[PDB]
Amino acid sequence: MDTSILNLRYESNHLIDLSRYASKINIGSKVNFDPIDKNQIQLFNLESSKIEVILKNAIVYNSMYENFSTSFWIRIPKYFNSISLNNEYTIINCMENNSGWKVSLNYGEIIWTLQDTQEIKQRVVFKYSQMINISDYINRWIFVTITNNRLNNSKIYINGRLIDQKPISNLGNIHASNNIMFKLDGCRDTHRYIWIKYFNLFDKELNEKEIKDLYDNQSNSGILKDFWGDYLQYDKPYYMLNLYDPNKYVDVNNVGIRGYMYLKGPRGSVMTTNIYLNSSLYRGTKFIIKKYASGNKDNIVRNNDRVYINVVVKNKEYRLATNASQAGVEKILSALEIPDVGNLSQVVVMKSKNDQGITNKCKMNLQDNNGNDIGFIGFHQFNNIAKLVASNGCSWEFIPVDDGWGERPLQ
Known part of the structure; x- marks a missing residue:
């Protein structure tokens, strides 16, 4: 039915929320935009390589039972150094007082964490090897979609397909942040970056058809890819x-x-x-x-x-x-x-x-x-x-x- 409570897009040289539900979007000085496809956003491992979204107070997550989903595309450069072993680093942060959600990465990993306000935690994790002849995933654009049903599971999909689901039903009140922070936070690899595009936020559990359609539409298969x-x-x-x-x-x-x-x-x-x-x-x-x-x-x-x-x-x-x-x-x-x-x-x-x-x-x-x-x-x-x-x-x-x-x- 409805669209998305946040819909984050580059349009006439501004990153904006088409949902019009954000107070404002706040772009750092070392955010880079791909000239040919300007929705593709590069974030380096510097402090001013950051985007901040400030949510309106209506749409802030603070609930026991409300469902919600996030989607976005990401291209994660191959990990080269040992320094990237055993270093989880946040990339999309909506926590406050230790409650909320965040997306984080590790070596061969994309991680979704929930924490409630009694320090109860759940992670769902997409794990991908770098010990492999050809990888679908290493340094290629992938579609991430994460859904959360408070009754049962948190689910993560890649490229439309369900990777992993974990119980979250024992978590009580999750109170996420007023602001979403796109930024490499705690990454020890100085040369690390990420590319990202088409961040959306939804106030429901997306079903499996909704996700496939989202994957299809945002693919732009109009245009051939390298x-x-x-x-x-x-x-x-x-x-x-x-x-x-x-x-x-x-x-x-x-x-x-x-x-x-x-x-x-x-x-x-x-x-x-x-x-x-x-x-x-x-x-x-x-x-x-x-x-x-x-x-x-x-x-x-x-x-x-x-x-x-x-x-x-x-x-x-x-x-x-x-x-x-x-x-x-x-x-x-x-x-x-x-x-x-x-x-x-x-x-x-x-x-x-x-x-x-x-x-x-x-x-x-x-x-x-x-x-x-x-x-x-x-x-x-x-x-x-x-x-x-x-x-x-x-x-x-x-x-x-x-x-x-x-x-x-x-x-």
Whole structure:
């Protein structure tokens, strides 16, 4: 029915409450806003990297039985140092006199704490490993949603799906703060930050459909995403992940038409001992997406955009293409000199893939210059070489370099 008792959004260069229920929003001097998507808010580990919301006194939580929910998106940079072991730090604080709620983070953790006014406590915790080949969660945008039913449970969801629920029914009067404080509080890692967006507060327990809808709407699947969940962009180099076989990367053997793109391995590993062990992400030839069909004056790659794909080899760009009249449904792809592409099939439709696990999947439907489908770019074995093909595993992700991952890129 109703919307949200707080609905926190960047609009005409002000962060404001669309619910109009806040006395005011108070932004620190070292809060940073992402230029392309200005709802994305970065908070560093400094004192003036903070936002304060002051609630109206009507909407302050002080109750035995009232239900309430919070949602927001967050991107949490990989934890690099040992200093981040065994250090819980608050990021969203609504406590007073030791009563209220807070969101807090630890190593591999997002935590929701409730405390009542008799020092009774409950935590619910989403736990995620950094000892993992590919993580859905490390340094990628995730949807957090936390619901509280005073009769039974407090529940935490990630990306729509229920992670963990704990009893809170033995907690009495919880009296939360007049103000919500967005700020890294008690973090010992000096270089820590977080990205955050779309904070909402609700005066009910959100049900599981409400949450999925919230997840869907706020995803903006209108726009394609890179691996981290930021907007996919033109004229930006990406490293390529093939989701079917994640331990390989794109290589080229030669350029021109007798050349071909393929998948080889291993991608290898990036490490710090006891802290993380993940697959290398900056492997292989970089792709740059080029405008063909869009008349849009930004650099944002939207669903069903029709594009050229360039391929960087020795810091020169070549056109991804094929001759579609080669025999067999599998059309091998090659990197071509951009002048000499001619009327080879080169146009790609960019298309986001809906489903339910890992976010930010893009497919790439190759077309000839009649705009007829050749097919989705994947790969196929030819005498155990996994050459890239358009054909009737074709789920890909595009990975730009990002401070939150911390890998040193060789090429």
